[PDB]
Design a protein around this ligand. Structure first.
Ligand code: 0SG
Ligand code: 0SG
Lengths: 207, 207
């Protein structure tokens, strides 16, 4: 899945380019097929959702929107007091919290975080990724959903196995494959988070 | 909403005109917006997408697919073992369940079914809806999720109002306006169901 479509390394000036960024992340939603139960299908559709809205905006004037920063700043002027709860800016605001979940989730598995009593489960890693990436932005109902949903969770091994289908590589080799992917993935997500902060564009509302 | 677009009548042969089906039902996702909670947004995604896929498979030869019945009888021949669990057929297989939920749900409200313990919840109605149209194609986890999502359900009052979009209607006038929609709506659906029975194209798998 992930380490064929590696993420371009972070540029000097820290300016992510929309087009290629979208090409790269448009590869992550099938992530969720590895999770292996159609419960998760709607999450996946939600993120694809975001990626498309961004790609739409971008496609409308690829020069005006060469970078992600260009998207945020151009929309800020363009829409109202409405901003940033509008347009691609909103799409990204959320997309990034999905990317982060993935990001923290993989890292956790990659770091031998486990439940000493039940090593082959993913609760504690999903939960930690959920704690840090989405929980702040979800009401009680939704976490009650997240909570059920954590029973569609596959076994850890079965994820990995599945997360590297065919390919042909130890569980171990598999984890390094991630550890490399994670380097740029993480650098990138952190810039996007920076960007949002510096442009007062994060919103704290819940769902 | 629901009654600026009403489903055509029913032909002498019960055959269903596809473009005027796709056109007509695609004013129904907007609906879920009326429940007033971003919880239900993914729900609508999955109907939106049912329609999309049904539509493209149509566009590709609107002569061969002039009817819904045509969709099934053609796809049936176009794959082996594959059909029914393929293409617009499967798309419509699921669409009819959402579309049924939407009917039965309203039908209930429109008939004043409620809980005397609180006639401004719609939770007994969502439930009849769900049990009758979708519960047996969902596995235990989805069902949990439904039960949780049922807590983001609005009140009957506001739900009715959100529907009205302040066309300045009275509240039992709004009920009335639905019952009208419900007529041909409840037919079309019933037919699609017969279709699917009589074609041997139902499947029973849970999710
Ligand atoms: C961040 C929160 C934490 C994570 C949350 C985890 C996710 C929770 C989501 C739970 C499930 C939501 C409901 C969606 C259910 C769908 O899976 C089902 C069946 O989906 C079908 O799957 C099929 C896949 O085929 S299969 O793998 O071989 O099965 C098809 O893809 C089909 O699309 S198609 O165009 O390709 O043909 C597709 O609809 N959809 C439904 O159940 C219909 C939903 C109608 C909802 C009605 C509203 C009820 C809600 C109550 C409102 C008060
Ligand atoms: C009949 C079946 C039972 C009924 C089913 C009930 C519904 C189940 C699904 C529950 C919800 C699933 C999770 C998604 C929740 C989303 O509402 C949130 C917010 O999403 C944003 O909502 C917004 C709505 O706007 S707002 O009202 O102004 O807020 C925007 O639409 C924005 O999209 S945008 O591109 O157009 O801009 C959109 O992402 N989505 C998330 O939190 C992202 C989820 C990330 C993936 C989670 C991965 C963890 C899953 C567990 C894995 C073990």
């Amino acid at each position: 899945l992930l380490a064929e479509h590696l993420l371009k390394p972070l540029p000097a000036d820290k300016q992510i380019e929309t087009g290629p960024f979208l090409e790269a992340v448009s590869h992550l939603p099938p992530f969720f097929d590895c999770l292996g139960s159609p419960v998760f299908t709607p999450i996946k559709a939600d993120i694809s959702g975001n990626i498309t809205k961004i790609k739409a905006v971008y496609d409308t004037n690829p020069a005006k929107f060469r970078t992600l920063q260009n998207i945020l700043e151009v929309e800020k002027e363009m829409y109202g007091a409405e901003w940033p709860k509008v347009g691609a800016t909103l799409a990204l605001m959320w997309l990034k919290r999905g990317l982060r979940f993935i990001q923290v989730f993989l890292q956790s598995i990659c770091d031998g975080e486990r439940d000493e009593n039940h090593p082959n489960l993913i609760r504690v890693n999903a939960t930690k990724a959920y704690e840090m990436a989405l929980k702040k932005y979800h009401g009680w109902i939704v976490q009650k959903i997240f909570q059920a949903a954590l029973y569609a969770a596959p076994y850890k091994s079965d994820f990995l196995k599945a997360l590297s289908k065919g390919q042909n590589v130890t569980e171990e080799e598999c984890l390094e494959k991630i550890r490399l992917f994670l380097v740029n993935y993480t650098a990138t997500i952190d810039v996007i988070y920076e960007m949002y902060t510096q442009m007062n564009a994060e919103l704290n509302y819940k769902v």
